[PDB]
Amino acid sequence: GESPKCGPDILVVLLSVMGAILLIGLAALLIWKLLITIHDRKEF
């Protein structure tokens, strides 16, 4: 086997979790901007 090596397998999960964090943050960022644009257009 010489493959129980939880390098690749941990690595897949460490990367997968990291990707998840990166993708939501980007989502959050866009959502924040979207609300700001709307509040700014919304002539009060």
Partner: protein
């Protein structure tokens, strides 16, 4: 039968994973802000 745990994920790794993502997220914000992405092209 439970000899699994081939690669049970230690909290450190999830902890390292979370930290890396936040660091990448902090870089992303700074670069875009510096680029004026968040600023208006208000003419």
């Amino acid at each position: 039968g439970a000899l699994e745990e081939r690669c049970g994920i230690p909290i450190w790794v999830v902890l390292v994973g979370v930290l890396g993502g936040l660091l990448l997220l902090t870089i992303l914000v700074l670069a875009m802000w510096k680029v004026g992405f968040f600023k208006r092209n208000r003419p």
